[PDB]
Design a protein around this ligand. Sequence first.
Ligand SMILES: CC(C)CCC[C@@H](C)[C@H]1CC[C@H]2[C@@H]3CC=C4C[C@@H](OC(=O)CCC(=O)O)CC[C@]4(C)[C@H]3CC[C@]12C
Ligand SMILES: CC(C)CCC[C@@H](C)[C@H]1CC[C@H]2[C@@H]3CC=C4C[C@@H](OC(=O)CCC(=O)O)CC[C@]4(C)[C@H]3CC[C@]12C
Ligand SMILES: CC(C)CCC[C@@H](C)[C@H]1CC[C@H]2[C@@H]3CC=C4C[C@@H](OC(=O)CCC(=O)O)CC[C@]4(C)[C@H]3CC[C@]12C
Ligand SMILES: CC(C)CCC[C@@H](C)[C@H]1CC[C@H]2[C@@H]3CC=C4C[C@@H](OC(=O)CCC(=O)O)CC[C@]4(C)[C@H]3CC[C@]12C
Ligand SMILES: CC(C)CCC[C@@H](C)[C@H]1CC[C@H]2[C@@H]3CC=C4C[C@@H](OC(=O)CCC(=O)O)CC[C@]4(C)[C@H]3CC[C@]12C
Ligand SMILES: CC(C)CCC[C@@H](C)[C@H]1CC[C@H]2[C@@H]3CC=C4C[C@@H](OC(=O)CCC(=O)O)CC[C@]4(C)[C@H]3CC[C@]12C
Ligand SMILES: CC(C)CCC[C@@H](C)[C@H]1CC[C@H]2[C@@H]3CC=C4C[C@@H](OC(=O)CCC(=O)O)CC[C@]4(C)[C@H]3CC[C@]12C
Ligand SMILES: CC(C)CCC[C@@H](C)[C@H]1CC[C@H]2[C@@H]3CC=C4C[C@@H](OC(=O)CCC(=O)O)CC[C@]4(C)[C@H]3CC[C@]12C
Ligand SMILES: NC(=O)n1c(O)c(C(=O)c2cccs2)c2cc(Cl)ccc21
Ligand SMILES: NC(=O)n1c(O)c(C(=O)c2cccs2)c2cc(Cl)ccc21
Lengths: 690, 690
Amino acid sequence: QYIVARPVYSTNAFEENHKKTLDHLKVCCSCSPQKAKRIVLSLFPIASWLPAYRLKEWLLSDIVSGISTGIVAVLQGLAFALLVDIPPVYGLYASFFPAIIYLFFGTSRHISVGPFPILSMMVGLAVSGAVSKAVPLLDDERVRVAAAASVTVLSGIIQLAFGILRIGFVVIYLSESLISGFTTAAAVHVLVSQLKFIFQLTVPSHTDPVSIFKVLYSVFSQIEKTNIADLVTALIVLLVVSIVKEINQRFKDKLPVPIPIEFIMTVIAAGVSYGCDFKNRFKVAVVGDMNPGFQPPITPDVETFQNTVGDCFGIAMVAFAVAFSVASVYSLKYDYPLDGNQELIALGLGNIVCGVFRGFAGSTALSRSAVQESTGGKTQIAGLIGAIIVLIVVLAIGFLLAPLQKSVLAALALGNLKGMLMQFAEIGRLWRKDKYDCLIWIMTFIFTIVLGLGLGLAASVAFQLLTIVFRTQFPKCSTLANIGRTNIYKNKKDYYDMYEPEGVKIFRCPSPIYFANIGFFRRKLIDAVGFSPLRILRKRNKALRKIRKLQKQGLLQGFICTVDTIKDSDEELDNNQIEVLDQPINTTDLPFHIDWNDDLPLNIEVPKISLHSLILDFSAVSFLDVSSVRGLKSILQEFIRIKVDVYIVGTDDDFIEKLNRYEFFDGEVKSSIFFLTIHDAVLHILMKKD
Amino acid sequence: QYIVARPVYSTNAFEENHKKTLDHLKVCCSCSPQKAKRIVLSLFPIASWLPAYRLKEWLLSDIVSGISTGIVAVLQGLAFALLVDIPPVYGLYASFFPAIIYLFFGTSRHISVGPFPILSMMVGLAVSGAVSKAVPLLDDERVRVAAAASVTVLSGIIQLAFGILRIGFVVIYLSESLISGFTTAAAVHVLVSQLKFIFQLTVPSHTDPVSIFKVLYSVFSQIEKTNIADLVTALIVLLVVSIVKEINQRFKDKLPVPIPIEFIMTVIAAGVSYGCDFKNRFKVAVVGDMNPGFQPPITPDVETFQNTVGDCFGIAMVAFAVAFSVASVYSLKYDYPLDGNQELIALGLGNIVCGVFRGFAGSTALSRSAVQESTGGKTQIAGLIGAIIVLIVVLAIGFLLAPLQKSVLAALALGNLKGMLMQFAEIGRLWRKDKYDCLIWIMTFIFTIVLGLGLGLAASVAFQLLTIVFRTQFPKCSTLANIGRTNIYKNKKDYYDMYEPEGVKIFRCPSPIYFANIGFFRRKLIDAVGFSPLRILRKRNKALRKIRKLQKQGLLQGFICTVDTIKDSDEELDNNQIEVLDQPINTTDLPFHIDWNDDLPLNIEVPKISLHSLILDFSAVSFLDVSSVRGLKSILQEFIRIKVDVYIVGTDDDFIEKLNRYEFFDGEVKSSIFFLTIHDAVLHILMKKD
Ligand SMILES: CC(C)CCC[C@@H](C)[C@H]1CC[C@H]2[C@@H]3CC=C4C[C@@H](OC(=O)CCC(=O)O)CC[C@]4(C)[C@H]3CC[C@]12C
Ligand SMILES: CC(C)CCC[C@@H](C)[C@H]1CC[C@H]2[C@@H]3CC=C4C[C@@H](OC(=O)CCC(=O)O)CC[C@]4(C)[C@H]3CC[C@]12C
Ligand SMILES: CC(C)CCC[C@@H](C)[C@H]1CC[C@H]2[C@@H]3CC=C4C[C@@H](OC(=O)CCC(=O)O)CC[C@]4(C)[C@H]3CC[C@]12C
Ligand SMILES: CC(C)CCC[C@@H](C)[C@H]1CC[C@H]2[C@@H]3CC=C4C[C@@H](OC(=O)CCC(=O)O)CC[C@]4(C)[C@H]3CC[C@]12C
Ligand SMILES: CC(C)CCC[C@@H](C)[C@H]1CC[C@H]2[C@@H]3CC=C4C[C@@H](OC(=O)CCC(=O)O)CC[C@]4(C)[C@H]3CC[C@]12C
Ligand SMILES: CC(C)CCC[C@@H](C)[C@H]1CC[C@H]2[C@@H]3CC=C4C[C@@H](OC(=O)CCC(=O)O)CC[C@]4(C)[C@H]3CC[C@]12C
Ligand SMILES: CC(C)CCC[C@@H](C)[C@H]1CC[C@H]2[C@@H]3CC=C4C[C@@H](OC(=O)CCC(=O)O)CC[C@]4(C)[C@H]3CC[C@]12C
Ligand SMILES: CC(C)CCC[C@@H](C)[C@H]1CC[C@H]2[C@@H]3CC=C4C[C@@H](OC(=O)CCC(=O)O)CC[C@]4(C)[C@H]3CC[C@]12C
Ligand SMILES: NC(=O)n1c(O)c(C(=O)c2cccs2)c2cc(Cl)ccc21
Ligand SMILES: NC(=O)n1c(O)c(C(=O)c2cccs2)c2cc(Cl)ccc21
């Protein structure tokens, strides 16, 4: 049973009966020989797991996973190089250099970095913006490569500058409702942007607010020019891949290393396209012969930095958020301490080295990481084998992809959109849960469809921040009362036999009071008390001025009258003199001790007040700002001058220690109004009144 | 003394011992004859105070205040029409039509609407943007008037659309730190923009990111062309007005209706400029003769709506925020119910009627409202007399301002910048108070100086919203303990003789848990408990799998061994099989009842745990979202499967009623874990353990 027999404490009788107990530059600038061995081995993390490498139980699994992710990285390299309007050889450069740099500088053991379609589509939008903003067949796709490389270099520089300044916690402003709303709209963007390769149409590059319908108009105005031999091949590839992926999602009994339908269908499509001369019989958009070898490095152009300095921030944000959210899943499994700041440095170095050698930007993909982890990827040596496969495709076997339809690539990339399109079926899962994150989802989807991918992310983040203000805009403030003659105080409109003491009003605001809900708090407090205290103070001051005017006239003196009725000379105060009606009342010059409650002398009318104390339950108020401290001080000054005691209960110690440095406590609003709980304020009032 | 002898309640034993107690379209669509008389008399509020008009005590004071504000409105009309590059006659139209419309449609009794310099400067920027974006001496200032009228019409339409949709609470996103940071930067903008009239220079219109230094470069590159006869006159006017304003701020004894130095200095300057032929002796920039009469109305141009649709939103926001913050001061005095939604409708109608008749936009000014209220303005009839004065200046006495220097106007408008420039001396008043609103002030000032007035307001609002996330990003989570063997639980690192029970950990997070602080909450909870529970669950599952493998081999059977030492066959789990290490443990198929704490059989190693229950004090957690509910459910599922009881205390009723519709409670995380306070959870643990 709950038995308590303590005295009544009031936060100053408690702090005197139980006694309590440069700034950062001398702990962060101490050059020690034990700290450099931590800093270097956390900056260059290949010296930490490569000596501690269990060879005999990991090498074969890493080799198998490396081959099985290198084939997928080759097939996804020259398929994401079509979302950018560059030749498809520049997609193989994008999946080789970051996989080499992340081997030396990365912390995650299970992701395989390369390109992934949302970031390559954002790069494809930014390069068309840089082309359309620059001052003055093969000469068009030269400046596309030369500007995509510079967009990649600038995004890597931004990511490296994030990683050096140790701001790796920027992923927490990217809640999963915003990610789930951005991802389906990016999937719709991919599905629309890959229509011009299935139908084999010619679409000009659009870079504007809404461009998901400009591409739709430019495609659907020339449906009569659709190559049937490309559409039939893309439809045949698309329904086989979905059926075999459905079979691979089910049927997982006696089935190790599930059947790769993408590689098999690509081999079959390339063999058919070579054997029957599909470039000459029909007229298809075949992937031409790539130059065997790498390209010499280019200097990044300066005039395209100043044109796309806004899009590279969004590219860096998306490339860090995706590569953190994917890697944290495999970090919760296997229990390794993934470091957020080193990921930005590794991805920035990988993107810089990729952009110097004419690649394009990218981070890890969810499907390639799932292929690398599901087939037994133990460490990042599988990424090295996956990069060696792309190296041997670039150097030697480049002619084997020369009879590739370029519509089977767009059909394969439309294959695994079902993972990002099923999240449409969660709005109903969010409508019956919060109705604020459903709003965040809907507004993120609308802003990403309409305002593109660069501006839509910033607009959805700015709305996600406004949602938190919407949550605490109109709090459900209530009035409390006692249940069962004990220390249980709950809401008055809930239980039956609640007892409320005489002249005590316990008020509770269940939200942190800041600038958007201080006026609402004041209005709700005035409506719950029953009067405005400034109105009663002004009427009391008017009555006191009339009383002392009658005393100066020689009528009053307790307070006996001479005549029964006087004239009702309502001396109204003009401007620049009405501010004396807000002054505190002093009755030291009078012999009587008026209380403004029983009655007054002749034709003096003052509204009555039954209160003598109110209690503010501030147990849920988390913080205050200058506007709340100013408004709260203005409220308590009206409540104290009206002879009503105020108590603020339920606060802990650093709340009072923060309120000390707000110039809150003066000779009127003393520091002895803070009590511990609600019940020892009611007990203090009851032991003070009698 | 505090004596309590209640039983121990657990939010389900409490709700069964004390029994408790279309949606809005049928209360908002009820056409009643008593509701129309409220709606019309709140929409057309001149029918409410004009019959209730105490004539014999208000008429003379309203006439005096009307004359004294009409002179100031005339002198401020054709001085704010120089911040826009229009002829000065179009400033007298801006202070006449809104004062007539606000008489019929306004609620405040003490503001005098007209132009005010921040909004006219924003109009002057937007009109230059509309000129510089339009496709193709007197022909330049024709399109300035024709585009400023359309910017005014669009801003009035936006304000009227705000007032009809009843969103009049948008001023609460405009905290006083943001207003105080925006106002001084607007004052610096006014002081720089009025330099070309003192020196009498020719400056082209700049409309861009940063333009406070483009005007400074265009002025200070041609200092050698400064008219000395204008600079000397502006300096003579400027130091007299400041001295007499200092004398008027002090010396307020036997001094009614303080001496207007602006009208006297304007009369003296005009008389000197006429008597000595200042347009011919020197070569000054005198205010030319205005056409006597109004202008016929124009249709607003459509092509300039689409160019400045972004700036008109900022003009409407500033025009509502200033006219609300000024009117609320005189609404707190005199006690009248000012309505926020009617102010938007009245200002929108005033701006529309002003923009049709070739005026420009505006709301009330602080100085004109102070002049109208301080001289005895009782109602809005003083605004009507102030408009009649502007009418008689436009119609008849227009030649009296024709010898006006146009540098004395810029010198007068630099006079009362001291009210908006002294707020520089509050950063030190905000540095020792919060250091978040000092940051809001500094970032608002920097964004308004750099990004102009239109974009700077939006950027400072977007940073003000981010400040609230910065306040609750890293909360100061703590561990509590008991003081003095009673129901007082406070922070463990504060007091000396705090007692903590055996195996109980009371944890407290003093912030609402949302998406930005759920990972920090999980990391702080794991660091305060002392272990990760998923690690102990995985090691317990590995040990249990080894135990049952030894049982299948025929060695174990309580739990006696056969041999002393076995081989250390560490059967490590591959991928797609390691997720069985997170499953709950069941020991129903074993005869023994292992507890994972004392010891285990041969070479089995499990980490020990001293906990058996932890308590989460959620009294300060105001709300949750889907990310917090998901992460909290994931935390409690690890803590329950490890055989550690969890209790969540300090929550009130609608917190549990909200958590019901989150799919939070299942067969594992039952609803019986919620307790009332901290002490009756500790008492429940102590009465359950023995
Ligand atoms: C939820 C909503 C309110 C958020 C804000 C949406 C706006 C950002 C969208 C909605 C309508 C859009 C406009 C709809 C149509 C057009 C015409 C379009 O014209 C062309 O592409 C050229 C046509 C030609 O040259 O003939 C240019 C973009 C624009 C202005 C769009 C710009 C982006 C707008 C303003
Ligand atoms: C806000 C969401 C929910 C709906 C979006 C509706 C509109 C904003 C969209 C739908 C149809 C779109 C239009 C569809 C086709 C075109 C043609 C397109 O191409 C041209 O005009 C090329 C030049 C020419 O041929 O004249 C320019 C964009 C435009 C006007 C689009 C502008 C944006 C529009 C009006
Ligand atoms: C804290 C985050 C938001 C990054 C820091 C702010 C950036 C958004 C700013 C700071 C430096 C700025 C740059 C400073 C100088 C220039 C050169 C300038 O070159 C010109 O040709 C001038 C005329 C013009 O293009 O407007 C173009 C803008 C640019 C790249 C600016 C683009 C915007 C930048 C990158
Ligand atoms: C958000 C924070 C952590 C980012 C910190 C880094 C940025 C402040 C720097 C990194 C690289 C900088 C860029 C490096 C080079 C240039 C080119 C420079 O071009 C010129 O001056 C034009 C010269 C010419 O046209 O001849 C304009 C600034 C800009 C875009 C810089 C803008 C500022 C950037 C993005
Ligand atoms: C606190 C800071 C980081 C906030 C972001 C600041 C930017 C929005 C500012 C800082 C530097 C500014 C730039 C500094 C100089 C110029 C050159 C200026 O050039 C001209 O006016 C034309 C010159 C010519 O024609 O010769 C155009 C604006 C611009 C790009 C400014 C645009 C606005 C910028 C990028
Ligand atoms: C961010 C805050 C704290 C400091 C701001 C520093 C810069 C962003 C400012 C200071 C000096 C400014 C410059 C001062 C003078 C000019 C000349 C001005 O006029 C012309 O160039 C006209 C055409 C010509 O004559 O070439 C254009 C803006 C510019 C470059 C300004 C651009 C913005 C600058 C670099
Ligand atoms: C909820 C708040 C933020 C207001 C609602 C959204 C507005 C910001 C949008 C909705 C309608 C939009 C307008 C819809 C159509 C047009 C015509 C369009 O005309 C053109 O010549 C098209 C090409 C172009 O200028 O880009 C110019 C943009 C404009 C005015 C748009 C400007 C932006 C507007 C006002
Ligand atoms: C924030 C919410 C509450 C505002 C609600 C009102 C707006 C949605 C409306 C009110 C007036 C509208 C404007 C009225 C007229 C026009 C002109 C119109 O011009 C054309 O279509 C061009 C025709 C041509 O060039 O021939 C473009 C949209 C625009 C700016 C409209 C944009 C949308 C506005 C601002
Ligand atoms: N598992 C696997 O081998 N693959 C995929 O999952 C692919 C996708 O459709 C992706 C959509 C978003 C990221 S990947 C894919 C595409 C090609 Cl061209 C070759 C192989 C592929
Ligand atoms: N009280 C008064 O009569 N006046 C002022 O206060 C003036 C200002 O400087 C203002 C600065 C911001 C708003 S007003 C002012 C200017 C002129 Cl041209 C004529 C009279 C004036």
